[PDB]
Amino acid sequence: CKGKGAKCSRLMYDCCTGSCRSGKC
């Protein structure tokens, strides 16, 4: 899983503990 600030998109669900914040985890 990814960690916060792990970058991402809008609605991906990869953050090990959280969602996409500001385009990132």
CHARMM-style PDB file with segment names, atoms N, HN, CA, C and O in Angstrom:
ATOM      1  N   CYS     1       0.861  -1.217   0.000  1.00  0.00      PROA
ATOM      2  CA  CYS     1       0.000   0.000   0.000  1.00  0.00      PROA
ATOM      3  C   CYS     1       0.883   1.249   0.000  1.00  0.00      PROA
ATOM      4  O   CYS     1       2.070   1.165   0.314  1.00  0.00      PROA
ATOM      5  N   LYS     2       0.327   2.378  -0.342  1.00  0.00      PROA
ATOM      6  HN  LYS     2      -0.637   2.446  -0.597  1.00  0.00      PROA
ATOM      7  CA  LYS     2       1.135   3.627  -0.372  1.00  0.00      PROA
ATOM      8  C   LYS     2       0.954   4.399   0.935  1.00  0.00      PROA
ATOM      9  O   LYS     2       0.006   4.147   1.679  1.00  0.00      PROA
ATOM     10  N   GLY     3       1.839   5.318   1.210  1.00  0.00      PROA
ATOM     11  HN  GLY     3       2.609   5.523   0.605  1.00  0.00      PROA
ATOM     12  CA  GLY     3       1.728   6.120   2.460  1.00  0.00      PROA
ATOM     13  C   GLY     3       1.279   7.539   2.104  1.00  0.00      PROA
ATOM     14  O   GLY     3       1.398   7.948   0.949  1.00  0.00      PROA
ATOM     15  N   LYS     4       0.777   8.275   3.057  1.00  0.00      PROA
ATOM     16  HN  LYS     4       0.681   7.942   3.995  1.00  0.00      PROA
ATOM     17  CA  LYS     4       0.322   9.661   2.759  1.00  0.00      PROA
ATOM     18  C   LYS     4       1.347  10.363   1.872  1.00  0.00      PROA
ATOM     19  O   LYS     4       2.505   9.951   1.810  1.00  0.00      PROA
ATOM     20  N   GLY     5       0.931  11.399   1.201  1.00  0.00      PROA
ATOM     21  HN  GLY     5      -0.010  11.734   1.251  1.00  0.00      PROA
ATOM     22  CA  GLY     5       1.864  12.145   0.307  1.00  0.00      PROA
ATOM     23  C   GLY     5       2.446  11.206  -0.753  1.00  0.00      PROA
ATOM     24  O   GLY     5       3.399  11.572  -1.440  1.00  0.00      PROA
ATOM     25  N   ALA     6       1.899  10.026  -0.890  1.00  0.00      PROA
ATOM     26  HN  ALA     6       1.125   9.728  -0.331  1.00  0.00      PROA
ATOM     27  CA  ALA     6       2.423   9.066  -1.905  1.00  0.00      PROA
ATOM     28  C   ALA     6       1.893   9.413  -3.299  1.00  0.00      PROA
ATOM     29  O   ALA     6       1.958   8.582  -4.205  1.00  0.00      PROA
ATOM     30  N   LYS     7       1.385  10.597  -3.477  1.00  0.00      PROA
ATOM     31  HN  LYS     7       1.332  11.272  -2.741  1.00  0.00      PROA
ATOM     32  CA  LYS     7       0.856  10.998  -4.800  1.00  0.00      PROA
ATOM     33  C   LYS     7      -0.216  10.016  -5.267  1.00  0.00      PROA
ATOM     34  O   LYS     7      -0.225   8.857  -4.852  1.00  0.00      PROA
ATOM     35  N   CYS     8      -1.097  10.471  -6.111  1.00  0.00      PROA
ATOM     36  HN  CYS     8      -1.090  11.412  -6.448  1.00  0.00      PROA
ATOM     37  CA  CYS     8      -2.177   9.582  -6.617  1.00  0.00      PROA
ATOM     38  C   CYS     8      -3.092  10.374  -7.556  1.00  0.00      PROA
ATOM     39  O   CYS     8      -2.627  11.277  -8.251  1.00  0.00      PROA
ATOM     40  N   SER     9      -4.356  10.052  -7.582  1.00  0.00      PROA
ATOM     41  HN  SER     9      -4.734   9.318  -7.018  1.00  0.00      PROA
ATOM     42  CA  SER     9      -5.293  10.786  -8.479  1.00  0.00      PROA
ATOM     43  C   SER     9      -6.596  11.078  -7.724  1.00  0.00      PROA
ATOM     44  O   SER     9      -6.561  11.374  -6.530  1.00  0.00      PROA
ATOM     45  N   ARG    10      -7.717  11.000  -8.392  1.00  0.00      PROA
ATOM     46  HN  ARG    10      -7.745  10.760  -9.362  1.00  0.00      PROA
ATOM     47  CA  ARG    10      -9.009  11.271  -7.708  1.00  0.00      PROA
ATOM     48  C   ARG    10      -9.814   9.975  -7.624  1.00  0.00      PROA
ATOM     49  O   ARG    10     -10.440   9.567  -8.603  1.00  0.00      PROA
ATOM     50  N   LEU    11      -9.800   9.341  -6.481  1.00  0.00      PROA
ATOM     51  HN  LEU    11      -9.292   9.672  -5.686  1.00  0.00      PROA
ATOM     52  CA  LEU    11     -10.554   8.066  -6.303  1.00  0.00      PROA
ATOM     53  C   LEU    11      -9.715   6.889  -6.810  1.00  0.00      PROA
ATOM     54  O   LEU    11      -9.962   6.379  -7.903  1.00  0.00      PROA
ATOM     55  N   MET    12      -8.748   6.468  -6.041  1.00  0.00      PROA
ATOM     56  HN  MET    12      -8.547   6.883  -5.153  1.00  0.00      PROA
ATOM     57  CA  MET    12      -7.896   5.321  -6.462  1.00  0.00      PROA
ATOM     58  C   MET    12      -7.927   4.254  -5.365  1.00  0.00      PROA
ATOM     59  O   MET    12      -7.990   3.061  -5.661  1.00  0.00      PROA
ATOM     60  N   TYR    13      -7.883   4.672  -4.128  1.00  0.00      PROA
ATOM     61  HN  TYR    13      -7.831   5.642  -3.887  1.00  0.00      PROA
ATOM     62  CA  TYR    13      -7.931   3.703  -2.994  1.00  0.00      PROA
ATOM     63  C   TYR    13      -6.630   2.901  -2.903  1.00  0.00      PROA
ATOM     64  O   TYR    13      -6.668   1.671  -2.869  1.00  0.00      PROA
ATOM     65  N   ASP    14      -5.506   3.566  -2.865  1.00  0.00      PROA
ATOM     66  HN  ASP    14      -5.475   4.565  -2.893  1.00  0.00      PROA
ATOM     67  CA  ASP    14      -4.211   2.833  -2.747  1.00  0.00      PROA
ATOM     68  C   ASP    14      -3.547   3.224  -1.428  1.00  0.00      PROA
ATOM     69  O   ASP    14      -2.732   2.469  -0.897  1.00  0.00      PROA
ATOM     70  N   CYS    15      -3.885   4.372  -0.908  1.00  0.00      PROA
ATOM     71  HN  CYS    15      -4.547   4.985  -1.339  1.00  0.00      PROA
ATOM     72  CA  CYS    15      -3.282   4.816   0.378  1.00  0.00      PROA
ATOM     73  C   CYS    15      -3.414   3.712   1.412  1.00  0.00      PROA
ATOM     74  O   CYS    15      -4.509   3.203   1.653  1.00  0.00      PROA
ATOM     75  N   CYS    16      -2.322   3.352   2.005  1.00  0.00      PROA
ATOM     76  HN  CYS    16      -1.433   3.765   1.809  1.00  0.00      PROA
ATOM     77  CA  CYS    16      -2.336   2.285   3.030  1.00  0.00      PROA
ATOM     78  C   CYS    16      -3.288   2.672   4.165  1.00  0.00      PROA
ATOM     79  O   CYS    16      -3.839   1.797   4.832  1.00  0.00      PROA
ATOM     80  N   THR    17      -3.480   3.945   4.384  1.00  0.00      PROA
ATOM     81  HN  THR    17      -3.032   4.656   3.842  1.00  0.00      PROA
ATOM     82  CA  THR    17      -4.399   4.383   5.473  1.00  0.00      PROA
ATOM     83  C   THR    17      -4.953   5.774   5.152  1.00  0.00      PROA
ATOM     84  O   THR    17      -4.520   6.761   5.747  1.00  0.00      PROA
ATOM     85  N   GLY    18      -5.885   5.862   4.240  1.00  0.00      PROA
ATOM     86  HN  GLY    18      -6.237   5.061   3.757  1.00  0.00      PROA
ATOM     87  CA  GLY    18      -6.460   7.195   3.895  1.00  0.00      PROA
ATOM     88  C   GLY    18      -6.894   7.210   2.427  1.00  0.00      PROA
ATOM     89  O   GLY    18      -6.964   6.156   1.794  1.00  0.00      PROA
ATOM     90  N   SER    19      -7.178   8.369   1.894  1.00  0.00      PROA
ATOM     91  HN  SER    19      -7.121   9.225   2.408  1.00  0.00      PROA
ATOM     92  CA  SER    19      -7.608   8.451   0.470  1.00  0.00      PROA
ATOM     93  C   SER    19      -6.738   9.468  -0.276  1.00  0.00      PROA
ATOM     94  O   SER    19      -5.680   9.856   0.222  1.00  0.00      PROA
ATOM     95  N   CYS    20      -7.163   9.892  -1.435  1.00  0.00      PROA
ATOM     96  HN  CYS    20      -8.022   9.577  -1.839  1.00  0.00      PROA
ATOM     97  CA  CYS    20      -6.359  10.876  -2.215  1.00  0.00      PROA
ATOM     98  C   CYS    20      -6.573  12.288  -1.662  1.00  0.00      PROA
ATOM     99  O   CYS    20      -7.687  12.809  -1.712  1.00  0.00      PROA
ATOM    100  N   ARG    21      -5.539  12.895  -1.147  1.00  0.00      PROA
ATOM    101  HN  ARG    21      -4.634  12.472  -1.106  1.00  0.00      PROA
ATOM    102  CA  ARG    21      -5.672  14.270  -0.603  1.00  0.00      PROA
ATOM    103  C   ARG    21      -4.836  15.234  -1.445  1.00  0.00      PROA
ATOM    104  O   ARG    21      -3.611  15.120  -1.485  1.00  0.00      PROA
ATOM    105  N   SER    22      -5.475  16.157  -2.100  1.00  0.00      PROA
ATOM    106  HN  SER    22      -6.470  16.250  -2.068  1.00  0.00      PROA
ATOM    107  CA  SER    22      -4.728  17.138  -2.939  1.00  0.00      PROA
ATOM    108  C   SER    22      -4.063  16.423  -4.121  1.00  0.00      PROA
ATOM    109  O   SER    22      -2.977  16.818  -4.545  1.00  0.00      PROA
ATOM    110  N   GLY    23      -4.686  15.402  -4.644  1.00  0.00      PROA
ATOM    111  HN  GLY    23      -5.568  15.081  -4.300  1.00  0.00      PROA
ATOM    112  CA  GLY    23      -4.087  14.676  -5.803  1.00  0.00      PROA
ATOM    113  C   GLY    23      -3.093  13.624  -5.308  1.00  0.00      PROA
ATOM    114  O   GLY    23      -2.652  12.782  -6.091  1.00  0.00      PROA
ATOM    115  N   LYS    24      -2.745  13.658  -4.054  1.00  0.00      PROA
ATOM    116  HN  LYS    24      -3.103  14.342  -3.419  1.00  0.00      PROA
ATOM    117  CA  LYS    24      -1.780  12.653  -3.527  1.00  0.00      PROA
ATOM    118  C   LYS    24      -2.478  11.777  -2.491  1.00  0.00      PROA
ATOM    119  O   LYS    24      -3.683  11.917  -2.278  1.00  0.00      PROA
ATOM    120  N   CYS    25      -1.755  10.897  -1.860  1.00  0.00      PROA
ATOM    121  HN  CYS    25      -0.777  10.784  -2.033  1.00  0.00      PROA
ATOM    122  CA  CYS    25      -2.386  10.019  -0.834  1.00  0.00      PROA
ATOM    123  C   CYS    25      -2.671  10.834   0.428  1.00  0.00      PROA
ATOM    124  OT1 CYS    25      -3.195  10.297   1.404  1.00  0.00      PROA
TER     125      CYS     25
END
